[PDB]
């Protein structure tokens, strides 16, 4: 069997854990959202190939520069998330996360995930950013950051609606195999 390892990195509170939770369960937590996702192996098929994808959350490790990298060795694909309702989280991609990930993960493919897309169109969210002279990240900003950092692909999704989640891991697995 083909064992690959995924590590999902990004700013705190920009989706990371929520995203991993739906995917593995194929359903958005109804009654109660969990805080803790545990290291877990997911079965995924792609291009008629069966993969065992080790899923690694990095939640909680965002402030601890020398704990974080204990998570990076032997990694086949990195999901870098920002949140679309947070143009700050995005500028942290080129400035905090890629330089890091390229240092500890030479030549490991990166897929740029734009999370909380279900919010590019939310009047409350749009106001608050309009408060700091900001507005929800547009798709070409994502697409452009993706070609800027040398990502394998750019994918937007919504943990809420489940829209684009499945499509995100499939890409990541395609990436691992390459």
């Amino acid at each position: 069997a083909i064992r690959k390892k995924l590590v999902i990195v990004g700013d705190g509170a920009c989706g990371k854990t929520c995203l991993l939770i739906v995917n593995s369960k194929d359903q958005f937590p109804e009654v109660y959202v969990p805080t803790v996702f545990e290291n877990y192996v997911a079965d995924i098929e792609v291009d008629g190939k069966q993969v065992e994808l080790a899923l690694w959350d990095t939640a909680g490790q965002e402030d601890y520069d020398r704990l974080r990298p204990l998570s990076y060795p032997d990694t086949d694909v990195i999901l870098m998330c920002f949140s679309i309702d947070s143009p700050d989280s995005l500028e942290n991609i080129p400035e905090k996360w890629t330089p890091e990930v390229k240092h500890f993960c030479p030549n490991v493919p990166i897929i740029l995930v734009g999370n909380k897309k279900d919010l590019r169109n939310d009047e409350h969210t749009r106001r608050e950013l309009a408060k700091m002279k900001q507005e929800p990240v547009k798709p070409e900003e994502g697409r452009d950051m993706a070609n800027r950092i040398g990502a394998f692909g750019y994918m937007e999704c919504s943990a809420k609606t489940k829209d684009g989640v499945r499509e995100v891991f499939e890409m990541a697995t395609r990436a691992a195999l390459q």
């Binding site: 545990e38 704990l67 204990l70 890629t98």
Partner: protein
Amino acid sequence: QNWQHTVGKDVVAGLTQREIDRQEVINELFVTEASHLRTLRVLDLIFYQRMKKENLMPREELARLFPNLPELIEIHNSWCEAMKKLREEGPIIKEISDLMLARFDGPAREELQQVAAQFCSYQSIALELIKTKQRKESRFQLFMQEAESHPQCRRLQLRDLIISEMQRLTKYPLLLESIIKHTEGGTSEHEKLCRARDQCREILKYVNEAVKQTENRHRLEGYQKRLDATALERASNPLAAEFKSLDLTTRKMIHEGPLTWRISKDKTLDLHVLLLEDLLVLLQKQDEKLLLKCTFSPVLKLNAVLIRSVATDKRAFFIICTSKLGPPQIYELVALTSSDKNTWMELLEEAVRNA
């Protein structure tokens, strides 16, 4: 499965959404804990014990992999027993603060940060060792693929399982932050949870440091064998004469990484520089060696330099030798990217500001 749906199926009715969301989060803590105790016993059983009683490797090498597995299992076990005793006096959990503090504040804090620091500080290196050993020792590589085959490993490898202590520790302020947001404000309990939360971040900073030093110490030991300060016991300028005996081993490292030295008229130079406490150092990667060679000294004392940022060049920056003796000496150094130039500056100015 869930708290509303299992325990308290009858008593669910008389409660508020905040008091429910609170019990859901307290329950996640209690369960993910017994889940982590089980992950720890899987290590103990499937790995530690069998590797010990079968001599898969030297006792000394094992010691570095599982320094204190039994003390770790006892930390978490003792707590999970407290947890189990509370869950007892009613499916509805009232005050949870004393418990948290009994694990994350005071002496309890000291115990935990020492016990988790010793278990994690070395991990990174020992995992390198195991990778090596799987490659070179067929006996080892078979033990490994026999143990990881076992059902209770959930198809995970040793190297995955073992990092779950560090991971669990990092989940504790998230779990607290959650319980806090669904706890009545102005309570002693609300206040105490916050002390507990802030104390977890403090434990984490303590472990973060343990790892940094342990890793950095072993790295520096590495860099010292490869070091070539021949061209320095004679030299050219006595600015670099006193560093012919160096020894990185006695210093602390702040930061390291690559850097291109724009030294002469369109003559550059690829370096790998170390930022120690008192010293910036400029080694050139030969192949498997590291060279201290001069003109310019290759070892800047920090208390005597200035950091100065470029305007058009977003990758470059200057360092200036502020000693009266040692002329117009200015090192123009180029980083990987804007982000790398930026971290480098802050660290530098901190280092120097501490000098």
